[PDB]
Design a protein around this ligand. Structure first.
Ligand SMILES: C[S@@H](CCCN)C[C@H]1O[C@@H](n2cnc3c(N)ncnc32)[C@H](O)[C@@H]1O
Ligand SMILES: C[S@@H](CCCN)C[C@H]1O[C@@H](n2cnc3c(N)ncnc32)[C@H](O)[C@@H]1O
Ligand SMILES: C[C@H]1CC[C@@H](N)CC1
Ligand SMILES: C[C@H]1CC[C@@H](N)CC1
Lengths: 281, 281
């Protein structure tokens, strides 16, 4: 069998590889190269522009922490926006909340959505839900135009190289600011503390220019570079996102595989070198 | 430039790779294959039997958490044992404690020690310290013979395949039990929650057969398989290892890069699926 290997200039001098059972689908969409394969040990794998975006084995770590962090802090969230997140993992976790009334998803590339509906039926099952509304558009354009404001905005983008390039700037964070309710929350995918401290420092400067509370958490996920991924957490109220305001005790949440009440706060407890870097910001 | 790739049957279907700047030393010692290279982005790298044992870039994460967890719980530790840990990283962190009077290290392979003294002079610098006593021996034999008992025992072994094979059993944990003071602590290297739950379940059954409190913590380290490594924490008193009994505030600790008072407790906050697996044990 052959191996898929994940090289990038965004993590120079290192690579992570998975063994391929069979290749399932490959294409050049309007925005990116799309690859789906079955791996021998991580289940099916979505690769976009050569970078692992998700695998069946560990996807729940990122989707649960990205969703249930902000959704346990927001008191009664009604209107939620997902930016990117074509695969549907976030949406799946959002549908567990009976209080949610609407879920807008703004994803630039419909190939991602359709591929996910076909090959990742346990991830993309949230699309069945009547509350979900799909907009195929650059979130950068979408956030300049939206009329609604949102209780939570979850930014589940790919890397700064490619289509997500328009989301890694000051102007984008202003649009997130204006699209949020007076007391709303944003969580954004924010790279790895092991290799991307320059970027984390930028993203935090952008956010702090606008939000009352910017906080950074970290998720263990083995198929992302360095085995972890940060979440940039932005708050309009002074309280922030480190403390859950509810426990997830209904039958909808009995199946949670990573998130719990205790590791919500823990994820915000960062290595010493990172804290040293991010407090003259 | 060529790439070093880390394959193993202990993590089938995945591999992590580093780019090689130059190979520094290679040998077949009495127990294992030894390789030292300079990588392009992770500094120098020690590989033993084809498995990355440490790199300069992230070694502090594992050494600080392995050492300062138990050393902040032990009230006034005088006599500390390191099992394995030929490179000297643990010893370096132990020497920061002015209360420590003796440090025995039991390492099977002196090639590891000497290679570390030559190529990893920032890791192996603790060997200068007059309190350190080196025993070249299988820890399995050493613990059956030692006359002293220890305040802390830190088990900083390699994987169950090879020389460390004798350390992954019930009998070994009895020897650790008998070599500890009435109120002493053991911390042992305990594989990755992402791939080694079978093993974690075994190690915990062995420990719980003997110790009042067995607890598991987790460290983010990018150059180990899945980007993380667990610590099996064993206690003879009912309190356990989750809570520091001191802050590391003296000039010796001003340089700490990972460990702090807050992420000591956080590391013990495990993903939901792992907790589900380890409590009918
Ligand atoms: C599939 S998801 C992978 C993470 C696991 N939930 C990453 C998505 O970000 C989308 N993306 C990237 N850039 C944009 C922009 N600019 N706008 C909207 N969506 C985007 C991209 O098409 C992926 O589907
Ligand atoms: C270098 S250390 C790497 C982790 C970073 N501190 C791993 C050590 O475990 C030793 N080891 C392995 N098995 C044993 C036994 N059985 N006894 C003592 N030491 C051992 C092995 O020689 C490495 O030096
Ligand atoms: C969701 C994102 C996808 C690309 C990154 N490299 C990891 C996390
Ligand atoms: C210290 C140990 C070395 C081998 C393991 N695979 C990672 C952690």
């Amino acid at each position: 069998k052959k191996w898929f290997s994940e090289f990038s200039i965004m993590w120079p001098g290192q690579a992570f590889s998975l063994k391929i059972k069979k290749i399932l689908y490959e294409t050049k969409s309007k925005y990116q190269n799309v690859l789906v394969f079955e791996s021998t040990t991580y289940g099916k794998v979505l690769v976009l522009d050569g970078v692992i975006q998700l695998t069946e084995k560990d996807e729940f770590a990122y989707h649960e922490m990205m969703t249930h962090v902000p959704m346990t802090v927001s008191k009664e969230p009604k209107n939620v926006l997902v930016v990117g997140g074509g695969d549907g993992g976030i949406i799946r976790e959002l549908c567990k909340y009976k209080s949610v009334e609407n879920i807008d998803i703004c994803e630039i590339d419909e190939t991602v959505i359709e591929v996910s509906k076909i090959y990742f039926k346990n991830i993309s099952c949230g699309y069945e839900d009547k509350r979900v509304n799909v907009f195929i558009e650059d979130a950068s354009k979408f956030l300049e135009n939206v009329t609604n404001t949102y209780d939570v905005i979850i930014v589940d983008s790919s890397d700064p190289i490619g289509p997500a390039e328009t989301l890694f700037n000051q102007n984008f964070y202003e649009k997130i600011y204006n699209a949020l309710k007076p007391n709303g929350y944003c969580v954004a995918q924010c790279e790895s503390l092991w290799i991307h401290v320059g970027t984390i420092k930028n993203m935090i400067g952008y956010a702090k220019k606008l939000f009352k509370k910017v906080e950074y958490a970290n998720i263990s996920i083995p198929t992302y570079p360095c085995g972890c991924i940060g979440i940039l957490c932005c708050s309009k109220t002074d309280t922030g996102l480190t403390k859950p305001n509810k426990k997830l005790e209904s039958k909808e949440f009995a199946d949670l595989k990573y998130y719990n009440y205790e590791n919500h706060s823990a994820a915000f407890k960062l290595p010493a070198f990172l804290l040293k870097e991010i407090e003259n910001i």
